[PDB]
């Protein structure tokens, strides 16, 4: 089983600075996308950042010059720095992960997993 633990979270005044981690209970570096997703209270999720198997990276333009998602393929470990945060980063941030690459959604059962989550409280 492919099982992903989220630490890093916490309460944090605005503009304070964060940095989440995901521990992967395999070896990431062959790992298609690493992705961190967010969800406010009463809101959908929405993809925060992606990291792709070949190096590139896609980030949500709201966190575009504040948040850098990387992977540490010797700890196995995503991380997501998350600098001159705000209120509205308010959420839980959850990691993500799709193993293969698959243009048909065929594989979703055993390429794609979820962690349970990390709260992130941004208040004064």
């Known amino acids: 089983e492919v099982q992903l633990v989220e630490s890093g979270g916490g309460l944090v005044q605005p503009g304070g600075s964060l940095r989440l981690s995901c521990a992967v209970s395999?070896?990431?570096?062959?790992?298609?996308?690493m992705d961190w997703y967010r969800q406010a209270p009463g809101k959908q999720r929405d993809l925060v950042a992606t990291?792709?198997?070949?190096?590139?990276?896609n980030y949500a333009d709201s966190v575009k010059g504040r948040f850098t998602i990387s992977r540490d393929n010797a700890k196995n470990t995503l991380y997501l720095q998350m600098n001159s945060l705000k209120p509205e980063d308010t959420a839980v941030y959850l990691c993500?992960?799709?193993?293969?690459?698959?243009?048909?959604?065929?594989?979703?059962?055993?390429?794609?997993?979820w962690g349970k989550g990390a709260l992130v409280t941004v208040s004064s």
């Open positions: 993500h992960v799709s193993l293969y690459r698959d243009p048909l959604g065929v594989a979703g059962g055993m390429g794609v997993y």
């Open positions: 395999i070896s990431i570096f062959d790992i298609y996308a």
């Open positions: 990291s792709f198997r070949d190096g590139s990276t």
